[PDB]
């Protein structure tokens, strides 16, 4: 039918202008030259580090990446940080500067940029789902499969809808980080609002979670020396009773939060469509 | 009937807590236990 289709070049290329950098632009490269196996000698990336990262906060690694061990759990200030990538080959260390090189391809820009940690920045995303139901109580069905529905927040920086989530703090696990970000962003808890049972309902909601995927993010802040990799945690409400007690109200770095149907035409931040695909694949839902 | 198929003891416990407001958890447990023990015999209760 299509002739010279030539497979499907699915490769991700980040946008030219780096977000919140004041107009600093990367070195452009077409999508057919990205993988690290091909040589590509005409490669001149730009070294850029954000002033916030360069001011040295608690969540930022030191500017000299020497003596740091990757691919294993490393202790920084007595707190454990993961540093292992989901890529089968692993992370290879450049001999000249000691900085890690991104195994998922070139992005045309070195340095850390907006990311505080060298190498793998582990992020946790929380997909809280429920079946999309009509008033009468019957679950809506499209393409012979039952339709899911997830909580989505509108991001502060670019005003495009996304899955709630954030970077894992030092000395903490994916479980607390996922739960803490969901209360902070989707419910605005803390920065005592809801009390007693509602918390108990939420606890019931949080007692059954499944890690559905651990993938590489197509995040525009990714560089050649710092990239985001996500662990996705799905909280599914089969009955829908616990999900109905959630009073959605945008807080912290989220403007608005709402329940949104899952389909293939969704325009979300980074590779969250792939994450939603994994959630619907696991639950045999429509996508 | 089907509307009453989603009814659970947990939601009943929350309803008891929101209406009577007990001071202690043991008092609520005793109050529910008494309430559930009252409707044990279906003949003796008629709901209008």
């Amino acid at each position: 039918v299509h002739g010279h289709t030539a497979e499907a070049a699915e490769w991700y290329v980040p946008p030219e202008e780096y977000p919140k950098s004041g107009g600093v632009k990367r070195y452009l490269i077409d999508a057919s030259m990205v993988p690290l196996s091909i040589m590509c000698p005409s490669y001149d990336p730009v070294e850029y580090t954000h002033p916030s990262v360069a001011a040295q906060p608690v969540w930022a690694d030191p500017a000299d990446p020497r003596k740091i061990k990757f691919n294993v759990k490393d202790e920084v200030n007595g707190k454990v940080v993961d540093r292992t990538s989901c890529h089968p080959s692993g992370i290879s260390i450049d001999s000249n500067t000691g900085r890690p090189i991104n195994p998922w391809g070139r992005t045309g820009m070195t340095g850390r940029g907006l990311l505080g940690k060298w190498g793998v920045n582990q992020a946790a995303d929380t997909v809280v789902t429920r079946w999309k139901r009509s008033p009468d109580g019957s679950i809506l069905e499209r393409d012979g499969k039952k339709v899911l529905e997830f909580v989505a927040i509108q991001r502060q920086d670019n005003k495009m809808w996304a899955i709630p989530g954030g970077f894992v703090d030092n000395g903490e696990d994916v479980a607390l980080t996922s739960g803490r970000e969901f209360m902070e962003e989707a419910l605005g808890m803390g920065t005592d609002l809801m009390s007693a049972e509602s918390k108990d309902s939420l606890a019931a909601l949080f007692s059954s979670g499944t890690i559905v995927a651990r993938i590489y993010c197509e995040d525009p802040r990714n560089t050649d020396n710092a990239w985001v990799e996500t662990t996705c945690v799905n909280f599914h409400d089969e009955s829908g009773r616990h999900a109905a007690r959630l009073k959605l109200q945008g807080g912290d770095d989220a403007e608005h939060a709402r329940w949104m149907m899952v389909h293939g035409g969704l325009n979300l931040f980074a590779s969250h469509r792939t994450l939603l695909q994994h959630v619907t694949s696991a639950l045999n839902a429509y996508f | 009937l089907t509307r009453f198929k989603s009814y659970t003891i947990d939601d009943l416990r929350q309803k008891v807590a929101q209406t009577f407001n007990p001071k202690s958890s043991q008092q609520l447990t005793n109050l529910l236990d008494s309430a559930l023990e009252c409707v044990q015999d279906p003949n003796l209760v008629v709901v209008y």
Binding site: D136, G137, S138, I139, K146, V174, A175, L176, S178, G179, R180, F182, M183, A203, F206, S207, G209, T210, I211, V233, F235 | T2, K5
Partner: peptide, 19 residues
């Protein structure tokens, strides 16, 4: 409605309660 309902219910573990 009852058949439809009896029909609706007929069709790594992580604990995040610490948050």
């Amino acid at each position: 409605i009852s058949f439809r309902f009896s029909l609706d219910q007929q069709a790594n573990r992580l604990n995040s309660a610490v948050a």
